[PDB]
Structures are given as C-alpha cells and as structure tokens.
Amino acid sequence: QKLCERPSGTWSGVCGNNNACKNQCINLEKARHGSCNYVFPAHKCICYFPC
C-alpha cells in the first residue's frame, strides 16, 4: 500500500534479473515485492518497502 520503491537496500544497482532481484530483496531485507524495473538509464533492482 504505502510502499516506497527504493532500489534494494542491499542490491542498490543494476539488476538484469527480476526473479533474483525480488528474491534477494525480500530474502535479505524484508520488503514486500521487488522487480528488475526499467526507467532511465538502465534496469535496476527496485524493491517495495512498506514505508
């Protein structure tokens, strides 16, 4: 709901892989979903924390 779409607390960078980005994010930190979202410049491991 009130999620903040931070580049993952850990993986604060380029992703090239949605599944991993998601997994790694919520596996290491405790965010809800994550995904290898686009937007300029390149894809990055965006993750949704209940901020």
The CATH code of the domain at 2-51 is: 3.30.30.10
CA 11 to chain centre: 7
The size of the chain, in residues, is: 51
The domain ranges of the chain are: 2-51
Own/partner long-range contacts of 6-10 (Cβ < 8 Å, ≥24 apart): 6/46, 6/47, 6/49, 7/44, 7/45, 7/46, 7/47, 8/34, 8/45, 8/46, 8/47, 9/47, 9/49
